[PDB]
């Protein structure tokens, strides 16, 4: 197995944008992928 440190909202996010939290830049407590983390993943440059 391999549980991810994301929230029910962040999941919908990656599901609505097409991103995979599993590989997002989780900066939250204990590497927690938050909304800002999702935007950061898709953003950059």
Q: What is the CATH number of the domain that holds 43?
A: 4.10.320.10
Q: Which two tokens stand for residue 26?
A: 């989780």
Domain of residue 10 covers: 1-45
Count Cβ atoms within 10 A of the Cβ of residue 2 and give its class: 0-12 exposed, 13-18 middle, 19 or more buried: exposed
Task: HSE, CB side, 13 Å, CA atoms: give it for residue 42.
Answer: 14
Residue pair 17/10 in contact by the 8 Å Cβ criterion? no
For residue 33, the SS3 value is: strand
Beta bridge partners of 42: none
3-class secondary structure, 32: strand
């Amino acid at each position: 197995n391999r549980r991810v440190i994301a929230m029910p909202s962040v999941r919908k996010y990656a599901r609505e944008k097409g991103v995979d939290i599993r590989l997002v830049q989780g900066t939250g407590k204990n590497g927690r992928v938050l909304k800002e983390d999702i935007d950061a993943f898709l953003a950059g440059g």
